[PDB]
Design a binder for this molecule. Sequence first.
Ligand code: NDP
Ligand code: NDP
Ligand code: MG
Lengths: 298, 298
Amino acid sequence: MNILLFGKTGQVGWELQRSLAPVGNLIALDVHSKEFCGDFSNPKGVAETVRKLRPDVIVNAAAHTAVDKAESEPELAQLLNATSVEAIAKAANETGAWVVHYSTDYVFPGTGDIPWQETDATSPLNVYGKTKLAGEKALQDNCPKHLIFRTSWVYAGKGNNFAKTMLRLAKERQTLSVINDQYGAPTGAELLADCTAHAIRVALNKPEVAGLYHLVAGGTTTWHDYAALVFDEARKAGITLALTELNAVPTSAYPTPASRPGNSRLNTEKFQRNFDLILPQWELGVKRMLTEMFTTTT
Amino acid sequence: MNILLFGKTGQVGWELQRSLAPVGNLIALDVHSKEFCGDFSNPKGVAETVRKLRPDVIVNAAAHTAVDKAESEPELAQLLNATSVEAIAKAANETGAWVVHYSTDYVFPGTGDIPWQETDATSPLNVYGKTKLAGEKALQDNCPKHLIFRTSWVYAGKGNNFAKTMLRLAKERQTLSVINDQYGAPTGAELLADCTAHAIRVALNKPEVAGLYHLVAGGTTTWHDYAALVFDEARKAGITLALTELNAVPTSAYPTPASRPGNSRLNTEKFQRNFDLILPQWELGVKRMLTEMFTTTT
Ligand SMILES: NC(=O)C1=CN([C@@H]2O[C@H](COP(=O)(O)OP(=O)(O)OC[C@H]3O[C@@H](n4cnc5c(N)ncnc54)[C@H](OP(=O)(O)O)[C@@H]3O)[C@@H](O)[C@H]2O)C=CC1
Ligand SMILES: NC(=O)C1=CN([C@@H]2O[C@H](COP(=O)(O)OP(=O)(O)OC[C@H]3O[C@@H](n4cnc5c(N)ncnc54)[C@H](OP(=O)(O)O)[C@@H]3O)[C@@H](O)[C@H]2O)C=CC1
Ligand SMILES: [Mg+2]
């Protein structure tokens, strides 16, 4: 049984090369895949590889994820987050393949306290959310064998991430200022990839689980609380920091082209009973990646 | 459903903290676990934590793995690779918990060409192999709900490994000399942990799969061929190397207290059909860890 993976070199995709490797025979691609087209710009191009490879499961981790630039390039985001998904969906339905795809909390507005469920109404605040919603609707309509996982604040230790950019500030700077009103749950690429591997194995035996799922680490926190923990662990690890005065702030204080949401809390009870899997507190994931980041030996 | 993991900070254990995290509620320990005894020296000590925690699945990645030192300290190896396993097995059988445990190719002699199967006869060449065999026999006899995975040449990117120590030589040195007659298959901690997570989920629904399994990346190579690939990829990555003359050698040329085997090839067909999982060629695993090692940004 063969698995096709697009977006191989992303945060989640890099971890999915690991997790999908024993599930089945894996073929992994990206934009610069030379011997197979993986550029989500050319949707009939990606679609022709689906038809030319004939996979049992397609896992799509390729996506336009520059939230702000998106507003200035709305049509390029549509192509990547909706046009090529529909294209890929339809081609998957020709051979009854499964399609696994990732979405976002930006499909919802911002109305604090309450965590958003699957049956809830959707009102996208910005373009990213708008385009990504379109993709999930295109998929749902064009292919009944799908698994949609909406996630949030996704990070990995390979490459750029929040913790990193903040630490880098904390080394170079003395007093920092970061948001305390956008609430959410940081989700590791490790967790998303690992859960995906098991959901695929269940899906294959129990078609009834097809559908849409909320999938994020447990708990709830803010960018501020988040950075406090990154500083706290840095210190405990013996990193020195030039930072000394940590200040919390409103959203309004910081410009941003795209409207960021206030309430990114997602209820994940559905995924839990449907797949019989645990979703751990966000803090474990972050401490783990921080510890791989700080234990740098060559 | 609760999972108990010993040997949390080892190569395989570090990756099992990741992989077992969604399978069930995880409790992870090591020697210095302060609020729970994880020191495999005190077998009634580890056993009391099994009884005091009451887990559905126990996964044992703690072990004495210093192959040579073992000959000079044979009784300390027995304690760690056999005494505490038996102790843990018996206590697991009190509550019908599963026990997942790791063994080795050193349970077999050395008689080239042919890859060793599960039904094959065992004749341990050194103490490590001897003690570890004892453990797997103690487990099989004391607990019918077990999964034994014999593996080989196990590596990880966190910490010390073969590739690393060789590169370090290749930077510092000009002509290197490494073995070409011990044949085997390098197996990643990533793969062992990932496969373990899925085998646990099958085991739980299908008790019939309990037993002993060979579990190693596919393919076959030698320490020399192995190092050639580590150098080849280093160069391709733009690392510079002071190495220029790579020479292959016999085993005899190098001293070693413990008798190392010649034929570490393991047939893994059993694990494959029994769990419906793919086992990928060793080269993927190694290239992946090399690429995480070489892409060092802070
Ligand atoms: N980061 C986050 O905060 C969130 C992510 N998600 C969802 O998770 C999934 C992946 O996110 P993540 O892996 O973290 O983000 P990444 O940006 O790491 O991954 C997206 C992938 O799309 C690739 N890509 C870019 N342009 C193209 C193109 N023209 N054709 C094909 N591939 C292209 C990207 O490569 P490159 O960057 O090198 O161009 C990258 O490989 C998506 O559904 C995403 O929306 C959801 C909510 C939040
Ligand atoms: N490395 C290899 O080539 C092979 C490994 N295996 C099997 O895989 C499994 C794990 O190997 P791997 O993870 O690679 O090896 P590691 O040495 O990385 O892991 C073994 C663990 O045992 C821990 N440990 C050491 N002493 C004690 C003690 N007194 N009480 C409790 N724990 C202790 C070790 O910690 P610390 O080192 O910090 O003391 C480490 O955490 C074992 O079955 C092993 O035999 C099999 C064949 C080959
Ligand atoms: Mg990793």
